């Protein structure tokens with residue numbers, strides 16, 4: 117993501133890194149000891165999930181690596197429009213929770229007030245390179261009306277818009293599937309937006325997680 121800075125070391129215990137073929141693919145969010153949430157467009161064979169990570173190159177004492185035994189994409193995911201861009205990953209081994217690995221509670225209230233948020237990820241930074249160190253940026257939710265004006269005809273009830281008019285802080289390539297956190301609850305997942313990235317042009321678009329309470333619950337319990 118662009119125009120942010122490195123996250124406080126203890127502030128992102130829910131952040132996951134998704135790899136395939138040995139390279140970063142996407143972000144993700146631990147929401148249950150057995151389950152990571154991410155974007156549907158992040159699905160590829162042979163996913164490796166890393167928890168407890170801060171710097172990608174380092175072999176950190178806190179990190180946990182796991183394969184995936186079930187990837188559950190939402191049945192109504194529409195790849196062309198990114199509608200319902202959400203996927204649940206069942207870890208081959210339950211997360212060993214610690215001071216640096218812990219689930220993030222979901223925002224269940226679709227009408228939630230809070231528009232002050234942050235995003236996290238190892239996606240492309242403003243210089244065009246990919247960071248070793250996890251980045252964080254504060255951004256703000258826009259209203260549904262303004263979201264709709266920014267992308268006429270293309271925004272569904274399953275999407276949220278967020279951005280930053282001061283610097284253009286925005287998610288970028290490599291950040292997909294990572295958390296939009298508002299009021300310290302999981303509010304969204306990085307899904308799509310402007311390319312090149314930068315939210316002064318238009319806001320980033322996020323999967324609206326509150327819409328999926330029932331589906332997440334049903335899936336985790338099957």
Ligand SMILES: NCc1ccc(NC(=O)c2c(O)ccc[n+]2Cc2nccn2Cc2ccccc2)cc1
Nearest residue numbers: 141157287288289290291292307308309310313320
């Ligand atoms: N906020 C702007 C933004 C720009 C890029 C991205 N993510 C990506 O480009 C991305 C990624 O991080 C990991 C794997 C694949 N992608 C690209 C992608 N493929 C399908 C959907 N997407 C995200 C996307 C982002 C912008 C326009 C169209 C699609 C997310 C947000």
